From a paper:
Box C/D ribonucleoprotein complexes are RNA-guided methyltransferases that methylate the ribose 2’-OH of RNA.
Thus, to understand whether non-canonical box C’/D’ motifs lacking the 2n−2b G•A base-pair adopt a k-turn-like structure in the presence of [name], we set out to solve the structure of the [name]–snR51-kl1 complex. Instead, the 1n adenosine and the 4b guanosine formed the first A•G base-pair of stem II, rather than the 1n and 1b nucleotides. In our structure, stem II was disrupted with the exception of the first sheared G•A base-pair. The guanosine of this base-pair engaged the backbone HN and the side chain of [name] residue E38 in two crucial hydrogen bonds with its O6 and imino hydrogen, respectively. However, even in the presence of [name], the box C’/D’ motif of snR51 is not a bona fide box C’/D’ motif, as the backbone of the box C’ sequence adopts a different conformation from that of a k-turn.
Residue numbers in the entry: 1 to 123
Write the structure that this text describes.
RNA sequence: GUACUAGAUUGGUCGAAAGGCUAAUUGAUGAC
């Protein structure tokens, strides 16, 4: 297939599943921010530990600023295929084009793993 | 304009009301 230009690397299915799992566990035991306004602010404030970006966002410009900003702030980001499922994982009733984990809670080791894998995918 | 926010509308139903329940539509692409 072909990906939107804001998608900078290919994410294996098991790694996207881990991202959604991390969002759900952080929702349950830590702190997240959901929606692109809240997500971008958390990145600008240095609060985000991981940013999760859906791959089916149209128009792209809603999230296109996130990867360059995350790279500047040196905050890891990861992609999932469905904004609908990302909103569900974030505990809301509609889609979420992006989410930020602020406090991973019990997702701490999962976020570290994703971060380590993304660093290799970034090369 | 900035920050915050996860509700909102209509119909049905229950209720003495406040409103609860419920369905459809709608809201993190940020509704009210
Ligand atoms: Cl009503």
């Amino acid at each position: 297939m072909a990906k939107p230009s804001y998608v900078k690397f290919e994410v294996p299915k098991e790694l996207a599943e881990k991202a959604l799992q991390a969002v759900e566990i952080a929702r349950d035991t830590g702190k997240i921010r959901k929606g692109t306004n809240e997500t971008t602010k958390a990145v600008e404030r240095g609060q985000a530990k991981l940013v999760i970006i859906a791959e089916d966002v149209d128009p792209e410009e809603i999230v296109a600023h996130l990867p360059p900003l995350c790279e500047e702030k040196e905050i890891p980001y990861i992609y999932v295929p469905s904004k609908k499922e990302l909103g569900a994982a974030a505990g809301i009733e509609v889609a979420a084009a992006s989410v930020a984990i602020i406090e991973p809670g019990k997702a701490r080791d999962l976020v570290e793993e994703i971060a380590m894998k993304v660093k290799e995918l970034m090369k």
